[PDB]
Amino acid sequence: MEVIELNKCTSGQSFEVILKPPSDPSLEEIQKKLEAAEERRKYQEAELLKHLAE
Amino acid sequence: MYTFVVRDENSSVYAEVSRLLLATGQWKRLRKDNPRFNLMLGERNRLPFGRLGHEPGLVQLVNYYRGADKLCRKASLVKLIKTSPELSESCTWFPESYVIYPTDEREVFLAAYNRRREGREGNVWIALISSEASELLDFIDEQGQVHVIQKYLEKPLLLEPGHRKFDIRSWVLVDHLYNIYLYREGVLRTSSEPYNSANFQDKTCHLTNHCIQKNYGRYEEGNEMFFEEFNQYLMDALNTTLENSILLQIKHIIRSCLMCIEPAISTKHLHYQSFQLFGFDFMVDEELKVWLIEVNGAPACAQKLYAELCQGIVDVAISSVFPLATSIFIKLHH
Amino acid sequence: REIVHIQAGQCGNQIGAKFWEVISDEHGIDPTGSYHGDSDLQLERINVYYNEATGNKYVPRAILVDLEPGTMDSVRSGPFGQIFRPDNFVFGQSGAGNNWAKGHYTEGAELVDSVLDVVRKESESCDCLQGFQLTHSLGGGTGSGMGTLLISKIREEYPDRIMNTFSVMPSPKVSDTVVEPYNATLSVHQLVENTDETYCIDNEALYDICFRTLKLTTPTYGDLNHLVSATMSGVTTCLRFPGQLNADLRKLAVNMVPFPRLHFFMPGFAPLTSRGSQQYRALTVPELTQQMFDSKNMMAACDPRHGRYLTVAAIFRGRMSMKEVDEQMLNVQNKNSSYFVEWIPNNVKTAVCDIPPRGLKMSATFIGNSTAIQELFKRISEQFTAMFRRKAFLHWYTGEGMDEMEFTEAESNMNDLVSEYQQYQDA
């Protein structure tokens, strides 16, 4: 019904039609998160090499 | 060899259907959470429609129409009729009703309540039954949940011998093509007590539920008169048939209700398909005018008609989609 | 995406030899190492198994290991015997005498370092090593004993590399000695820990197939190896030829192995064909699918109906309607959804390759991760106990330094493997 904000140009045109009105983490924390997981790998790899050593 | 699942054990109807399907030897029952099913006899609450039709190489079907609760809830049905132009606020086969929340449209109800009394005309309403508004306007608050108030039919048709009240139950099936099939065999769920205008506080005389009644089993077995008898009674007592005097209005109301919500629930172009069995409850006044009382989304059948109805469900609503290696339904065309 | 092949023992080297004989023919490589194909598809993914050498010659990235020179001398004088890099022939002289202890602790230990030098030599040349594969039996001494010693030492020097095996299981129907259950149990303990994928090739199944199905009165080890070479070619098709599947060994293992210990697969193949006996009638897709899921086509003598599929992989080869493939694959699952776990969504995956194997217009290879594989281990465990309860034939092992306790442990770990399989079967 109500057409508004009609803008026209050579490339085309745009508008709005209304039918009815209404009714972050830091670099620190990341680089530690990535390293706390690298320590868990190193530990898992260690317990493997220790197991293989036995 | 098709496959199905069952997720509602309390279902009297589909429990019989699940057995019929197995008896053919062309269907298999999987477990509750096996997604590789052709058919689903789902639960009543929180049925996961969002997970249907996403199994590659499997036509999926379910025995429930998503969004059909708008017709099967009392608060929703009133809103559906008043808001929808299809049915309109001037709807003639639905009692004048109003939605009332506990402490909405309360002030409008009182506006209509007045001139009803200030006009020398009968005025009784139902949520319980009372002639005074303030009586049970506080009742609804002391229950907790939302109810609906509507005009009580003070002039109901009365079955003789007995001078008795009754209500009609019709079973309607809507398949995947939204064909509306009316089951030819309905049932009158009658009261064995004589209707009494003088006192509404007693409800055995005003309410016709199947469990309330259990003078039981006096006139008809289990307080259930079928069409063959009720038809014969009308012919002898009123010189008319069931088809003419009542059923035309029933077929009209059924079709009108479902046609109204067809665009909101239809699975015509969807990735999964739906069918559903409904139970419409009608009321007849002394002038043979049919009124809609409610719609039941998970109806239970009558014992005699279980075998015939459940077989019908398999014929047109399941095998129509999953074929295998004189009709008990009247099709309401549109 | 280079793979390093190792073959240990009599069995390992004979199926391994036939493996290279088959895929070298598929990749158009001749017994000298020269390419002579009709397509560029044969050379596109050929770096995976072959090293490109001078004169545009292709050399298998293969290491041939044994404790006696008998079998490897036969390989070298075999059909494709000269394709192999002579330096990769690493052998002893004493043999292992079907003794796991000899292969794992004494005779093999003396030789294992020599083998690893060759492994390292190959691994270093690899642009990006994606894993190792081993062919061996578990009922002998070298392949069983030394092969698992190799795997242990490889995981030590390459802890982040995929290790897969094609392991031939021993059966009384096809038996060299009575101590095969002993060598097998000791080996399975090793495989449960240090492999990502083990293809369980039961000699019982291979025998029955050759007999009950393939119309062969008395099958030889050569007849049994036709089935193994066919299967091995089948499972590596996606790795060897360009297709829809962009997967290295790791990614493949991720989607097949829901639990680390449960990585023992039932291989299958269709159509089943005996040596020489030509195939005139090409199978329809419904027939390939129906056959590759039938127990009679399984290479592990287990009944799939006595268990449930954790995951499944199927590799169709040839020119066919992959729409029909999808339908037939999606069919089987929906006919028998009870034999698939419901708690791993979409656990059946399929891949297609346009080039079929030699002799067949189209074929299917089955890789099943079923819990029914416990039947295989329960069988070995019974044969094991039957002797161990009397400590029979144990002197052959205690003579090489082993203690009875090590047998009790191996026994226990496999009975645990069985119960672990039974856990997910009842879920």
Next chain:
Amino acid sequence: MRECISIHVGQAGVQIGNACWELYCLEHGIQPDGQMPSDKTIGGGDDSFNTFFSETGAGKHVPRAVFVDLEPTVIDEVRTGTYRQLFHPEQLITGKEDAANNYARGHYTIGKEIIDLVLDRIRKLADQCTGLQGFLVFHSFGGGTGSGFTSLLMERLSVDYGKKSKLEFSIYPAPQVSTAVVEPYNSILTTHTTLEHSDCAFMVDNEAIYDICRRNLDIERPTYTNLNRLISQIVSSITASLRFDGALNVDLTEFQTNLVPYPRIHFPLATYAPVISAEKAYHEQLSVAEITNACFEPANQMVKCDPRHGKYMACCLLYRGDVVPKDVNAAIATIKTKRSIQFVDWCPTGFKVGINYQPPTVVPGGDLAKVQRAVCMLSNTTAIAEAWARLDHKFDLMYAKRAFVHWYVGEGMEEGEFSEAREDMAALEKDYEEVGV
């Protein structure tokens, strides 16, 4: 003029990026060598297309894009593709080993060894920007890279570019074209970690694109090339307003404003029509009313779901071709009376319309037929939550048994991150339900 940088991550992201940039070049008349004859401002300028292309003194037009994969074979097809001349070597970043469909491996393990490099190569582009709006990130949910490395990248961009916006084009996992089985894990994981770092995300279910290609393009079994060419058309529609003159969705900020009232619920549903087969010999061209009406058919949606059983928060109509406002309002008025379109009470029931007179450009030899007029509807409906429900259910089934979990834990991840992510998804599903009913 303000620039936008496109980041293509993983196999899906890269191959889709190629489909898009191929399409952009054809639309803007740019050639495979990067020469754009119609551009008279040699060596620079601030036109609308410069939002996506930089310029060199030699007259080459270069995509403001960076391709990244942990494995080279897919990006190698770009290095030697028909548009090899278009890109610069430092725009194409490859690793050696992929993430093997493992989020933890793409995020933690291998991601860590390459994150600083990508950021540097991204910074190389941002330095060539007079005014950077933000980033367009293309990737898959299912891949270990597309999920794992993406969330890591998204986290950092919010640190190095706090102000800048970040949009997502996300491929939602479909078994029909997927070989993986752990994609539900990867999807939930990357969604959880990326949610606070993404302003607006356009999901695309391969299931939907697959069936559209079968149903409407008569392709018996779509390849990725089929899917990607169709996806590029949708993306092109959505980015057209950033590359062409207009007043609707001119910057990335406006996408959030117009489509995302609530930050967490930033997954608009895209619907595209008409999709017509090039092999369709005789085709009756469809009208504005017909194609607009198709925007409310689930069979045309990027994600299969039922908007009727949900509530809208916003709705944009983006037309390409012979369209005028008169015919659109007529179509809207007609469709409104016949279909179920319920908005939230705190939003106006209306549409923002954008029309570009240039009809949709088609790839020569492609599967799509030229059309006189086409449309892409961007509707933020709560009905898209069905896709989360599907995904979350598959997650629960597997995780209850801890299936495959050992693969992630073995890369340094903790079992607790599974439940953290799943909890975040449980919250998201609930948010959708608060608004939707």
